[PDB]
Amino acid sequence: ENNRYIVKTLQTDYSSGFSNDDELNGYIDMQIGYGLVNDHKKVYIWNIHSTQKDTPYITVPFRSDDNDEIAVAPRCILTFPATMDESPLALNPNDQDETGGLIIIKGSKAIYYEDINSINNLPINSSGGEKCDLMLNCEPAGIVLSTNMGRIFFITIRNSMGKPQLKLGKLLNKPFKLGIWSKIFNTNSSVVSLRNGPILGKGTRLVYITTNKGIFQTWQLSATNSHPTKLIDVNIYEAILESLQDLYPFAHGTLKIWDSHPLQDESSQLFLSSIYDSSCNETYYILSTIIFDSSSNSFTIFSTYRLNTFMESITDTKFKPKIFIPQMENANDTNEVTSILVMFPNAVVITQVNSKLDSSYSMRRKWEDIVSLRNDIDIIGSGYDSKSLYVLTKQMGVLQFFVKEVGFVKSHVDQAVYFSKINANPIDFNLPPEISLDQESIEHDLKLTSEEIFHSNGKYIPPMLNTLGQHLSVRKEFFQNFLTFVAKNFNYKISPELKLDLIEKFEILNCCIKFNSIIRQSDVLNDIWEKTLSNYNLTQNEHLTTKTVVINSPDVFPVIFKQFLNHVVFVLFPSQNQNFKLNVTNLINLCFYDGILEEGEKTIRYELLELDPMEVDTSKLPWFINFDYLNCINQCFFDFTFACEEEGSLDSYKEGLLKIVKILYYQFNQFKIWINTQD
Amino acid sequence: MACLSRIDANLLQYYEKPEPNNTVDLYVSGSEYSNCLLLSNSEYICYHFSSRSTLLTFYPLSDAYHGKTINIHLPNASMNQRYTLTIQEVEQQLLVNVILKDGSFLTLQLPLSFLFSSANTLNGEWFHLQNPYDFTVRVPHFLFYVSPQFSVVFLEDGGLLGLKKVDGVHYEPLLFNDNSYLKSLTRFFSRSSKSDYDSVISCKLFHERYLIVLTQNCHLKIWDLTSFTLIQDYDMVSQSDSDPSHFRKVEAVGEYLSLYNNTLVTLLPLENGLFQMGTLLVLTYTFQNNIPTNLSASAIWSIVDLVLTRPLELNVEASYLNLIVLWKSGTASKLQILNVNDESFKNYEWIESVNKSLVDLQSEHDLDIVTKTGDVERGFCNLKSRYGTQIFERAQQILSENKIIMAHNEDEEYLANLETILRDVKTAFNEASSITLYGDEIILVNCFQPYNHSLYKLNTTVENWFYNMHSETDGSELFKYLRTLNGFASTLSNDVLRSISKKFLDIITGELPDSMTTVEKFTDIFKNCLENQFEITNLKILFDELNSFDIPVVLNDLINNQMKPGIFWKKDFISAIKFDGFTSIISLESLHQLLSIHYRITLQVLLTFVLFDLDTEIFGQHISTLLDLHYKQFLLLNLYRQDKCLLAEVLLKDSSEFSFGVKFFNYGQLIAYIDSLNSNVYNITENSFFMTFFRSYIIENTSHKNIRFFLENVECPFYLRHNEVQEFMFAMTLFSCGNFDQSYEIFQLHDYPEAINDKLPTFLEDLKSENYHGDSIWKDLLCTFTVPYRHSAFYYQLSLLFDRNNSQEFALKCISKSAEYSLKEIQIEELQDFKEKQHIHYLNLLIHFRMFEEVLDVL
C-alpha cells in the first residue's frame, strides 16, 4: 500500500561534474542540500535546483590531486565556520562561509581553499602520512582530520581569510593502541562514519564520532579559543546489547560467533545495529533509536529497540548501508514533513520506520521489505535537500522518493491487495508488504488467497456495471494480469478440497461472455434467464446487470445460461428462428472450441495433475468432472443437430460443421493427454 | 524595509589601461585602508593607506582619473598604522601628522593645487623632521588629532600625552596626567601582553574638553582635559547583556566608536552576534538595547569603520541616524545598515546590501539573455570592459590589489588565488575599508584599492525589484503584482522569454505589422513561442493571480510613475572639470540598473496578455507605451556590456547640464540626475529621438575609431522620419568604417527632399571642431551645384568623399549616377556647375581603370 509516498522523477542535473555518474558516496549537509558524485580530476559540488541548468546554479569544482594520490567524495567538504546554517548567500556573491579543504591520503598536504570560487590563492597542513580517513568541517573554521585509527587531529584554521595552522589535537596514540575495537569503516559518508549535526537532532556545534563497534565520543570546539573540548566518551555498545538478544533469538553457538555493528549515527539520535551472525547470509537489523530524555549524550532507557520485519539479504557488491533522513529531530510524530527512515543497499529505496517506542506508535508509512526497481535504479547517495528527501540516482538523474499474515488475505484482500495490484507501476512500493502478506506461509494464507484475490478482479473497477459492459473487456486483461501477480510470487499450488484451477477454467468460459457483451445482435439476451434464476434482481432491461456476481464462478451458472437457448422455441421447423440459431452459433461456438486453443497455450500439467485428482471428487452438480457441464452441452449438442433438420443445407452446413468442432471439449479432461502417453 | 544596494566600481572600465593614469614616486626625506578627508573645496583627497605602512596615496575622489596622483614613500614606516595617521587642513595645505616608528614625528604639507591639478609645483622642503618627545623607548599605538593646536599621542607605556603645536609644524609636549601609567595593570588589564590596556583603541571628543577613549576591554574612560582627572569609569561587561565569561575582549587597535550627534556607539564582539548602541550626554552614560544584527558567513565579519549620519532619502526619508556599520570578510563585504528609527535601538529598519555586483545579480536571477558579449578575439574590446582591463590582462598577476597571495601548489595559496582573480567581475577590489560623507551626506564607502569604490546611491525603491523581491516589502500593491508575475516568469526558463521578447522587437519592425489590435498580435505570439511552453498549472496560476490585483490601476501606477519619468531637470548640479572615470560610472551603471530592470518588468507584463483575449485595448495606453519603451531599452543592453568606455560619455553629452561630470552632494540632485538620463534613453516615450541626437555625432567620432556594435544600436523600425534620416546615418555607419558598398546603396535608396533645411544634425568630427554637415556642408557644396537637387547634388557629396577615403568603383558608380541623372541639361552656365562639375568628376574616375567606352561621345 502506497501511504504518503511521492515517488516519480525530480530532474537531471547540470553535467560537467555529473559527467561521472558512478555509484559511490555523496557528501550531504543540512543547509539546503549539496550533491556530489566524485570525479578523479576535481570534486564538483553542486546545489540542487529545479531550474536545472545553470541560472541559479552552483556547480563549482574544488581541487583534488589528478595523481595516484586522489580524493573520494566524503574527503572534500564545504567548511562552515560555526557549524550552523548560513551557507546560502554565497551562491553569487561568493562570501567566506563555505570554504573547503582536502588533506591528502598518504601525502598529508592540505589544499585549503580560501573561498568557494577563489581557489587560485594553496596553504599546506600536516600531521604526516597516514593520519587520514576522511575530512569533516568543524567550528573554529577548523577541519576535522579524522584518522581511522580512531583519532581526530583537530586542525584549527584561523578565521580571518582562512589559512590552517598544524598542530595535533585531542587523541594521539590513545586509540592507535586499541585493536580490540574496530575503528575501521565499512560504511562511509561524513553523515555515516561521523556526524557533525548543525541543528539536526541534539547536534548543534557538536562534532560526533561512532566507530564500527559503537565507540561514541563527542567534542565541542569554541571558535574563539581554538580548542577541542571532549564532552563524552561512552560506548553505546553496552547501551543496546542486551535487548538485541531479547527480541530475535540467537542459540548458544549463534551468540558465540555473533557481531553487532553500529553502522550509522544520525547526530547521535539513531544507531543502525547490524545483528548478524556469520553462518547465515542475511544482515538483520534492529533500529535502535536512542533518544535522550533529560540529560543528553549518556545512557537512557529511551534507548529502544524496534525489531525489524524487514530482512536484508546480503549482496557484496553495491554494499553501503546508509541512512539519510532530513528531519531526524523527531521523537514525536509528524506526517507532512519527511522524517521517514530510509535504508538502502545501493539499488533500492527501503521505506522503513522510527519513533515507535519514542512515542505511542506514530502511524508511520509501511515497514517490512520494500523495493524500488522501476527503471535503472542504483544510488550514488541519498541525502536531503531543502529538508525533504533527495536521492541521487545514477542514470535517471535525481529521483524523488520523498515522503510527505491474516486479514489482508481474508477481506482486505479485497481492499488492500485490491489496491496493490490495480496499480503497481506509478509507485511499486505497494507490492512487497502486501504480496509477502500473501506469500508468507500459513495454511489459510495460500489456500484461500488464490481464490479471493481472484475475486478482486471480481471487484476490478469500483462501479459494478461499467465493468460488466464495455470495460468487461478491460476487466478481461485484468483477470489475466491479476493471475500474473499469482504466478510470479507463489500462492497457486496450495489448495483446498475445492479445486484451485477454477480460476483458470472460468477464463475459458469468459470468452463466450465477452463475445456477447461487445458484439450485440440478439445474443446479449442469452444472459437473461441465466442471471434471473440465481438471484432475483433489479428485474429490468438489463440482466447484464449484477454480472459481478456471475464473475469468478463457472459452477451452476453455465447450466442456467443454456436455458434461454432452450427458451428460443415455439415452432421452428420451417426455418426462420434459425437465423437466431445461426447468430448463437457464430460467436460462442468458437469459444467452446477454445479451451483447446486456450488450454493449449496454458494448463497442460496444471490440469491433469490437479484436474484428474479433483475429478475423483464429485457429488454431481458441484464443478469438477463438469468442465462445461455433463447434461447441458449435450442438449446444446442436440440443439445444433436439431437445428440442422429445421433448416436446409447451407445454414445447416454452418451450424453443423461447428457442432462437430466442439465435440472434443467435452473430452478435454483427459484429452490434454495428446502430447503424451499417461460425495 | 531595504532600499540601498551596491553598485561596484572600477574606473579602468572607462579606459583601456589596466592601471592608474599615472603614478609618481615623490620621496619623503594602496590596500588596507581608505578614508577621505573633509575639505572645504568639496573635492576630497581619498587617502588610501596600505598595509605596508609606508605608502599612502593622495588623489582626488571625483576628478579621479585626471588630476595628480602622488604616492609618498615614508623613509621609514609609521609607528603602528593608520591609527598614527591624522590628516586635516590647517592652512590650505594638507598637514599629514605621523609618528615615524623609529623615534620622531613628521609633518608634511601638500597643496590643493598640485594634488587637484596636473603636475607638481610643490618643491623645496615640505617634510619636517622633529623629535618633540622621545618615542624611541616610549611606544604609542594611537595618535588623536583633537585641535589644530593639539594632536595628542597616547603611549602604551606612559600616560596620555598632549602634543600641542605652536606654529603648525613643530610641537611641544604638554604632558597629561590621565591614566595609562597609573593603570594598565589593576585587575583586568595587563601590560605583559599586547591585549588588555587602559590605553586607547578608539577615542572620540565630546565638546572640546571631555575625551572618552574606548580601551581594549571596552572601558569608556571619561577624562577632562582642563583638570586631567577622572570623571566616570564605565565597563561594558555590566553596561551590557555581555558578561566577561563570554566577552571577546578586543585584543587589537580598531574602530568601535562613532558619533554625528549624541549617539556614542560601542560594538562588542562575543562571537560577533550582539551589536551595541549606547548614548552619552553632558558623565552620564545611558544604555538601552543590544541589537542582534543580520549577518551571514559564520559571523567572521570584522569591523573597519562605523560612522553615522543624519536622515537620508531612501524608501523612507525619516529616521534618527543611520549607523553605517561596515563589515568585510575576505573577497566579500557588506553594508548592513542598522537604521534605528529612534533612541530606542530595538526599533529599526534593516537595510541589506548585496555583496555582489550589479552584473552578479544578473547571473543569479538571469538577465544575461541580452548579453551580446564577445569571445577572446573580440575579448580585447568586450571582456576588457566587463571586468575592467585591470582584471582582464591579469589572471594571477594581481597579488595585492585584492589581498590574496600565493605560496606554492603544495599549499592552497596558488590554486586559490588563480581561481579568485578570473571570478572577479568587479567584486574583491571592493574590500570595504572606511566611509566618508562626500558633499554633505553621500554614503561613500571608499574600499582597499585606489580607483575602486562601493558606490551607495539613490538604490531607489524601483531599482531593487527583481534582484530583491523576498527580503523587502518596499513598493505598494504593485510590488506584490510583479512578484506574482514571477510566479509565471521565473518558473519558466527566461531564454523562452528571450524569444517572446524578440517577437516584441518584431511588433515595432513590422514583421508582425502595426495596424492591428494587440489582441491579434499576441494570439500570433501565442502560436509561436508560447505553445506548450506554458505549463498548464503556470497558466491557471497566473490567471487567478492577475485577477486578484486590479489591472488598469496597477498598470496606471507603474507605467506613468516609474518607467516613464516626467521632466527631470537640473536642480543645482555643480560639475567636476574633465571627463573622468568616477563621474562616468554615475552616469552609466545606476542608469542601467533602472533600464534592464524595466526590461524584465516589460517582459513580465507582456507575457500575461498572450494567454488571454481580454481586451488589450483597455490596456491600449499601457501596452503600447511598454513596447515603445522595450525597443529603446533593447538598444542599451547590447552596448552596456560591450563598452563602458563608450556609452557613459554619450549620456554625459546630451545636455550641458550634465557637462562631462557631475558632483552630486545629496539625493535631490541625484534622484533628478538619473531620472534625466532615463528620460533621454526613452526619447517620456518619444520627446525627441536619441537614435538621431546620441548617435549621428558619435558615429562620426568613434565609429571611425571603430566600434561595431553600432549594428546593435542602428535599430529603428524605419517607419516615420526614420526612413529619411536613419537611412541617412545607417549609410554613414559603414561610411565611418570604410565598408563601402553599403554606403553606396543606403545613401541613395531614400530620396532627399532634404536641401539646407536640416533634419540631420550631423557633426563630422574633424578632431578639432565640428564640420557641421546637414546645414554647413549643405549650404556650401549642394549650393555650388546651384539650387539643391533631389538626387544628384547629394550624389556628388557621396562620390567626392568616397574617392577621398578611397573607393573608386562605388564612387564612379554614384557619379555615373550624377552625370546622366542631372535634372538640368539645357546646357546653360548656371546649371553647368550641376552638369559641368559632375561631368568632369565622372571622367576622372574612368582613366585609372583605362576603359573602352565612356570616352566615346564624351570626348
Swiss-Prot record, chain A:
Gene Ontology biological process: cellular response to heat; double-strand break repair; mRNA export from nucleus in response to heat stress; negative regulation of transcription by RNA polymerase II; nuclear pore localization; nucleocytoplasmic transport; poly(A)+ mRNA export from nucleus; positive regulation of DNA-templated transcription
Compartments, record wording: Nucleus, Nuclear pore complex; Nucleus membrane
GO cellular component: chromosome, telomeric region; cytosol; nuclear envelope; nuclear membrane; nuclear pore; nuclear pore outer ring; nucleus
Region: Required for normal NPC distribution, residue numbers: 1-160
Chief site of localization: nucleus
Keyword set, alphabetical order: Acetylation, Membrane, mRNA transport, Nuclear pore complex, Nucleus, Protein transport, Translocation, Transport
UniProt topology in membrane: Peripheral membrane protein
GO MF term set: structural constituent of nuclear pore
Source taxon at top rank: Eukaryota
Subunit field text: Component of the nuclear pore complex (NPC). NPC constitutes the exclusive means of nucleocytoplasmic transport. NPCs allow the passive diffusion of ions and small molecules and the active, nuclear transport receptor-mediated bidirectional transport of macromolecules such as proteins, RNAs, ribonucleoparticles (RNPs), and ribosomal subunits across the nuclear envelope. Due to its 8-fold rotational symmetry, all subunits are present with 8 copies or multiples thereof.
Function field: Functions as a component of the nuclear pore complex (NPC). NPC components, collectively referred to as nucleoporins (NUPs), can play the role of both NPC structural components and of docking or interaction partners for transiently associated nuclear transport factors. NUP133 is involved in nuclear poly(A)+ RNA, tRNA and pre-ribosome export, in GSP1 nuclear import, in NPC assembly and distribution, as well as in nuclear envelope organization.
UniProt note: domains: Usually mRNA binding pumilio repeats come in 8 copies. In the 8-fold symmetry of the NPC the 8 repeats may be provided by eight copies of NUP133.
Entry similarity comment: Belongs to the nucleoporin Nup133 family.
Note: Present with 3060 molecules/cell in log phase SD medium.
The protein, known as: Nucleoporin NUP133
Biological source species: Saccharomyces cerevisiae (strain ATCC 204508 / S288c)
Residues of the full protein shown: 63 to 772 of 1157
Swiss-Prot record, chain B:
Region (Leucine-zipper 1): 108-129
Example GO biological process: protein import into nucleus
Region Leucine-zipper 2, residue ranges: 267-283
Key words of the record: Coiled coil, Membrane, mRNA transport, Nuclear pore complex, Nucleus, Phosphoprotein, Protein transport, Translocation, Transport
GTP-binding among keywords: no
Membrane topology: Peripheral membrane protein
One GO cellular component, as annotated: chromosome, telomeric region
InterPro entries on file: Nucleoporin_Nup160, NUP120_helical_saccharomycetes
The keyword tRNA-binding appears for this protein: no
Pfam families found in the cross-reference section: Beta-prop_Nup120_160, NUP120_helical_2
Residue numbers of Phosphothreonine PTMs: 389
Main location: nucleus
Cellular compartments annotated: Nucleus, Nuclear pore complex; Nucleus membrane
GO MF term set: identical protein binding; structural constituent of nuclear pore
Function recorded in the entry: Functions as a component of the nuclear pore complex (NPC). NPC components, collectively referred to as nucleoporins (NUPs), can play the role of both NPC structural components and of docking or interaction partners for transiently associated nuclear transport factors. NUP120 is involved in nuclear poly(A)+ RNA and pre-ribosome export, in GSP1 nuclear import, in NPC assembly and distribution, as well as in nuclear envelope organization.
PANTHER family linked to this entry: NUCLEAR PORE COMPLEX PROTEIN NUP160
Subunit structure: Component of the nuclear pore complex (NPC). NPC constitutes the exclusive means of nucleocytoplasmic transport. NPCs allow the passive diffusion of ions and small molecules and the active, nuclear transport receptor-mediated bidirectional transport of macromolecules such as proteins, RNAs, ribonucleoparticles (RNPs), and ribosomal subunits across the nuclear envelope. Due to its 8-fold rotational symmetry, all subunits are present with 8 copies or multiples thereof.
Name of the protein described by the UniProt record: Nucleoporin NUP120
Organism of derivation: Saccharomyces cerevisiae (strain ATCC 204508 / S288c)
